[model samples]
Target: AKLSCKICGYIYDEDEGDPDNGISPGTKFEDLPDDWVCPLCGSPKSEFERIE
Candidate 1:
């Protein structure tokens, strides 16, 4: 399953970032704080969506 951003089409792959570091699989976008911006396009987590 790939997680993508609805605002900018940023795809989050499990192989990229560190899981224990912070953002990881099973982590919901809404759970992220406002200060946390998308690494790809700086869009907030609120703009993300689970790609099907």
Candidate 2:
């Protein structure tokens, strides 16, 4: 599954986590830390919505 930032539409794919932000590949969206945010827009985790 993947998640999309509501504010910037940045896609966070579990199979390709944002390594540049310290999130390794295969990291699930739900498993992301509370302080983790969208790499592109800095949106809060709450700002992301699951996408099919």
Candidate 3:
């Protein structure tokens, strides 16, 4: 599954965790911490929605 930042259009893939943000590969979207923000736009986690 993947998530897209509503504000900046950043795609966060569960298969390719954001290493720059300290999230390891294979990390589930739900497993991400509450404070995690989009690397591209700095939008809060709540600003993202699951992508089909």
Candidate 4:
């Protein structure tokens, strides 16, 4: 499962976290930073939902 954006459907894969945005792999959803946002649509974490 992954955390995804509701509007743009952007995925935040934990196994391959967004290093381009300073997020490294092995980071869990609970450890995810509060400032993390979707790079594709700039969606806030508020608009994200867990997908399985």
- What ranges in model 2 sit over 4 Å off? none
Across 1-52, the per-residue lDDT of candidate 4 in tens digits comes to 4888898957887898788888898787777788878889988778888888
Overall lDDT per candidate, in order of appearance: 0.62, 0.90, 0.90, 0.82
lDDT of 3 by residue, 1-52 (tens): 9988999868999999999879999999899998888998888888989987
- TM-score against truth, every candidate: 0.48, 0.91, 0.90, 0.82
What lDDT would candidate 4 get against the real structure?
0.82
Q: What's the CA RMSD for each of the models?
A: 3.8, 0.8, 0.8, 1.2
Stretches off by above 4 angstroms in model 4 are none
Residues 1-52, model 1: lDDT tens digits: 4568776756765445426447666655555557867676777766766775
Clash pairs, model 1 backbone: none
**Per-residue lDDT value at 24 in model 3:** 100
